[PDB]
Amino acid sequence: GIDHTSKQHKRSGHRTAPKSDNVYLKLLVKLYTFLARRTDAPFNKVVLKALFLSKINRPPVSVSRIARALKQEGAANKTVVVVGTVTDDARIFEFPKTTVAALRFTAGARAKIVKAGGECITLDQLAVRAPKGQNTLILRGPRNSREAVRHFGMGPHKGKAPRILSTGRKFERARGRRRSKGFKV
Amino acid sequence: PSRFTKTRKHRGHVSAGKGRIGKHRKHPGGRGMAGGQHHHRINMDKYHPGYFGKVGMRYFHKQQAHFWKPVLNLDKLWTLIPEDKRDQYLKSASKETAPVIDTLAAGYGKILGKGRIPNVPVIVKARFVSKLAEEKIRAAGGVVELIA
Amino acid sequence: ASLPHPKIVKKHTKKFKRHHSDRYHRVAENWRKQKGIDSVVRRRFRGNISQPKIGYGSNKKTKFLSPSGHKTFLVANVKDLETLTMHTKTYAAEIAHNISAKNRVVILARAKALGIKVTNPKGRLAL
Amino acid sequence: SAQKAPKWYPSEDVAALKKTRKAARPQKLRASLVPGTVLILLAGRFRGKRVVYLKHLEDNTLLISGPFKVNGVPLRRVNARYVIATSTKVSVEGVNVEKFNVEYFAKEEIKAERVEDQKVVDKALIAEIKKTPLLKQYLSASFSLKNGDKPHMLKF
RNA sequence: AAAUAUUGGCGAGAGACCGAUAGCGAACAAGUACAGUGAUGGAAAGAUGAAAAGAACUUUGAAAAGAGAGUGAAAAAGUACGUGAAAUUGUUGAAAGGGAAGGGCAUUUGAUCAGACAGGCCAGCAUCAGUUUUGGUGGCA
RNA sequence: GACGUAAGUCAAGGAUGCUGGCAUAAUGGUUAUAUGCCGCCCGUCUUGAAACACGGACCAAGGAGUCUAACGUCUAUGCGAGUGUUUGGGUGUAAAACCCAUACGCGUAAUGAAAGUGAACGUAGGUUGGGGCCUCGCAAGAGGUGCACAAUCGACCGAU
RNA sequence: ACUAAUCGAACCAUCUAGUAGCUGGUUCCUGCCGAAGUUUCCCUCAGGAUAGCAGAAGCUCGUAUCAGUUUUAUGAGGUA
RNA sequence: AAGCGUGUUACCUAUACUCUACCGUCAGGGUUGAUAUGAUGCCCUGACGAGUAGGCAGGCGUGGAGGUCAGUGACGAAGCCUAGACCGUAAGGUCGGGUCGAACGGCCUCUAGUGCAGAUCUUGGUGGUAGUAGCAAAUAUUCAAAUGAGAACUUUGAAG
Ligand SMILES: [Mg+2]
Ligand SMILES: [Mg+2]
Ligand SMILES: [Mg+2]
Ligand SMILES: [Mg+2]
Ligand SMILES: [Mg+2]
Ligand SMILES: [Mg+2]
Ligand SMILES: [Mg+2]
Ligand SMILES: [Mg+2]
Ligand SMILES: [Mg+2]
Ligand SMILES: [Mg+2]
Ligand SMILES: [Mg+2]
Ligand SMILES: [Mg+2]
Ligand SMILES: [Mg+2]
Ligand SMILES: [Mg+2]
Ligand SMILES: [Mg+2]
Ligand SMILES: [Mg+2]
Ligand SMILES: [Mg+2]
Ligand SMILES: [Mg+2]
Ligand SMILES: [Mg+2]
Ligand SMILES: [Mg+2]
Ligand SMILES: [Mg+2]
Ligand SMILES: [Mg+2]
Ligand SMILES: [Mg+2]
Ligand SMILES: [Mg+2]
Ligand SMILES: [Mg+2]
Ligand SMILES: [Mg+2]
Ligand SMILES: [Mg+2]
Ligand SMILES: [Mg+2]
Ligand SMILES: [Mg+2]
Ligand SMILES: [Mg+2]
Ligand SMILES: [Mg+2]
Ligand SMILES: [Mg+2]
Ligand SMILES: [Mg+2]
Ligand SMILES: [Mg+2]
Ligand SMILES: [Mg+2]
Ligand SMILES: [Mg+2]
Ligand SMILES: [Mg+2]
Ligand SMILES: [Mg+2]
Ligand SMILES: [Mg+2]
Secondary structure, three states: OOOOOOOOOOOOOOOOOOOOOOOHHHHHHHHHHHHHHOOOHHHHHHHHHHOOOOOOOOOOEEHHHHHHHOOOOOOOOOEEEEEEEEEOOOOOOOOOEEEEEEEEEHHHHHHHHHHHHOOEOOOOHHHHHHHHHHHHHOOOOOOOOOOHHHOHHHHHHHHOOOOOOOOOOOOOOOOOOOOOOOOOO | OHOHHHHHHOOOOOOHHHHHHHOOOOOOOOOOOOOOOOOOHHHHHHHHHOOOOOOOOOOOOOOOHOOOEEEEEHHHHHHHHHHHHHHHHHOOOOOOOEEEOOOOOOOOOOOOOOOHHHHHHHOOEEEEEEEEEEEEEEEOOEEEOOOO | OOOOOOOOOOOOOOOOOOOOOOOOOOOOOOOOOOOOOOOOOHOOOOOOOOOHHHHOOOOOOOOOOOOOEEEEEEEHHHHHHHHOOOOOOEEEEEEEEOOOOHHOOOOOOOOOOOOOOEOOOOOOOOO | OOOOOOOOOOOOOOOOOOOOOOOOOOOOOOOOOOOOOEEEEEOOOOOEEEEEEEEOOOOOEEEOOOHHHHHHHOEEEEEEHHHHEEEEEEEOOOOOOOOOOOHHOOOOOOOOOOOOOOOHHHHHHHHOOOOOOOOOHHHHHHOOOOOOOOOOOOOO
């Protein structure tokens, strides 16, 4: 017998592979598993882990988010890296000329980047030209703006969104939401 | 499909995952929303506050079409011009040739002011506009023409 | 012969017969886990039958090996047999139960020509 | 196909052995075993015979000739673990035994040469056996455990 | 009028449907046989063989039938008919058995069985390594 | 690592060497039996079952978390400020597959009972962290940038 | 009491697979993790909701934040 | 004392402790310019293994469906029997022999009316009980012949 301080046989709880069966994604993982092992550049390990992520955990990255990132001083010539999808954003009217490396590009995003004079690159071409992630800018989309996140942690005085089908008057706007009817949460 | 369900794995195990003691029964707490004010009060006040009780005025014979008014913001205002012809107006920004944007034919009732359009004059035809949206359009050199 | 292998250890040669399969004819001997609340077999009381558990697993260097040192490959014709042309030290052919007598003759002669061991070289013979 | 196929087969190559650090070194006999000692045999066709220890061969066998003219035991080999060494000793510095070795006793009607190899050795051994009293009869008698003999207390 | 409906009727085409305890209650002389005064209730029951070629003839028997013979690819297909499981049963063989029997570990005995000679089986000694157990003796504080 | 001046050797990152018998039921497996020791009848409710608690004489076949409407979290996939061809139309090798317009749904705006109003002072803010990247350093470290995310103070929209 | 072996409301069919907080049953194997009978509310006390205990999915990072432990310093307590 | 109090040693044996091996699980690593083509692969290192209710994971089996093996089969498919054999911890899989007579598998996938010892479970079949309980109310039968394979029981006669 052993007085176990920790739970036995506990899995790490981190993805060690993509749940996806996409063969090309698994080839990209084959590439960055090699690069993470045979280089000491932290970029390769970060990209590898991002390659494992689920869909909600790799939100879209907008071209305007990329352009804002390129406004960081000393960052205007960095290769933006997005382990995910880059979407188009018509709310920006001046896009800079830059090389963006991403898993997926939408048609609008690719057209906007190319029309700016820039380049759209796959992650393997990024691995060829920046094996240690040289001069790279990893960008991530907003995880907590998901609709599902609105409803997490619901409870009195927490101010989250109730899980509700129909909205408007008559749908949870009464006793429990105003002092005139009972109380307010 | 059936072969991936836990029913298949529970075969050979007596209680079918329902417990020996609790012993899955028909409707142990009632059917539907029973007891929402009595024995389901805590759940209902925790997750659906405001559920019970009444609220303001009633509207007999409400037709939603009376209220049709899709909003469009200025930051999306220039998307109503097709991409092929958009860049020509964005350059050479001047009056006497300014893009007429009919936001009603685009399916919009009111123009709101989320703001930061380019400094190009545009003629915005709309049923309704917010006060700030008309400020930004005028500041850019355009105008809003009230239509019906 | 077969490739040299370590000694073959089984760790449990005795069949794992189902509890009370000797008691009632309706209970078959195929192993079933006792799930009863009071079961002496489930609770592992002294004197009761042993249950299959992973600790009984065979040495990986010896698992699936016959006492002759070969893994069994089920063969239905000459093409399936010629799958083991370059593998005679690790695999032995076993003719499928439903192969006819005259086809078994063909399989055996081919196997002898290629040096492939046949685990059942007597099925459906005129002897 | 009755059985589809293994996608990738194991290697048919046979691995070489790792180099082994087991150097053979000479056997250290027990102190009780000195050439000329009389030996009780504990096993074999000549069970219980008392013989004379002549030489320690290179295969770790002892070469005994409990004189063939005394108890019929020929020039033969024995394993030192199947032997009791006694305190009684007859000098073997009158007999040549260097002609006897492992290839003398190879497997493949008695042969002619072993008879005079015995009839020369027995001359030298019988000569000193005649000196001390009762030893020739002692070498003729066989050993056995009588009732109440305790070999853990017996001296030999 | 049409676009709509259609567990009835008639006429068609179909199925990742069921396959004789399933599928309609009913694959069959099935809403039949049968129960109930009555309203009603309501089964079970498919398969010899390619073809009866469904066993002429002899013999034992009062006869059923048996034994032969014969037909058939097959009677280990004889209408008590494809295959023909289990429970239960007869016979033969083996074995054990002082108020149950059955089971686990181990081995004896009996019976039974596989593979290999291009090393397979069982051992003995020596010199070592790992882990231990039990002695003898030396030097110091 | 040790030994040897070196050669090389060794008990130093896991057994070799020598020899014998048999090559078959001899070892082994299976099975019946015997012997030693052990072993209460399962299932179930239950704090507690071998129970003088219940079901179970036996055997075969049948026999119980399903489908559907709406939905939550998570995951895969397609496209992405969009998305959804399949109500319908076109077409067909004909319930398939292939093609498609106008709409409609959900999303892209909230808030108020409602009338209504409706989202940049600022590099879309400041502060504290913050992976990664950049510069200097043999390195440590130092400095610049700092996405996601976290805490916090503000700004904007609506209600009051 | 009797009303077709049926009577403190016959029998037949259908609604009807009537509802059941209650009894019984709930069908392969192995591997890993692993409980609760306690809090609050309830015409609640053989039942639920709720929190807790549990699993699973992970995610953000990479030796911190920590800790059913002591020491030092400093509080508090009214039982023996 | 083989009792009581006490002291000393030796000794016995747990699924516990030490070491070694094998299985599995978890963790941390290695491995690409032939990794001398298994990268969900191979390999290195360390630790760990109780379990109802319950959760999850990897597998085994069954009916049907798309694809493949130009798979098996009247020279015998399937089914069934088999103290004959082999593989797997196991679900199970495979082979031999007998019976048998017409269809059926392996693999990759799809799908479900998909796995039974229990439900006083349904239907059907079958036991022990057991050649057992019994076949005892209504007073009562008997002789002979005939018939017949066979007569307590049929017929006729006689009689009661
Ligand atoms: Mg369980
Ligand atoms: Mg239950
Ligand atoms: Mg086995
Ligand atoms: Mg078994
Ligand atoms: Mg218990
Ligand atoms: Mg029927
Ligand atoms: Mg036949
Ligand atoms: Mg038969
Ligand atoms: Mg037949
Ligand atoms: Mg039949
Ligand atoms: Mg039959
Ligand atoms: Mg039977
Ligand atoms: Mg008796
Ligand atoms: Mg016994
Ligand atoms: Mg040793
Ligand atoms: Mg035996
Ligand atoms: Mg006992
Ligand atoms: Mg009780
Ligand atoms: Mg019990
Ligand atoms: Mg009860
Ligand atoms: Mg009973
Ligand atoms: Mg019953
Ligand atoms: Mg069944
Ligand atoms: Mg009912
Ligand atoms: Mg545990
Ligand atoms: Mg109340
Ligand atoms: Mg109860
Ligand atoms: Mg006090
Ligand atoms: Mg007090
Ligand atoms: Mg004492
Ligand atoms: Mg466990
Ligand atoms: Mg099938
Ligand atoms: Mg057959
Ligand atoms: Mg049997
Ligand atoms: Mg036929
Ligand atoms: Mg079923
Ligand atoms: Mg049954
Ligand atoms: Mg059960
Ligand atoms: Mg009687």
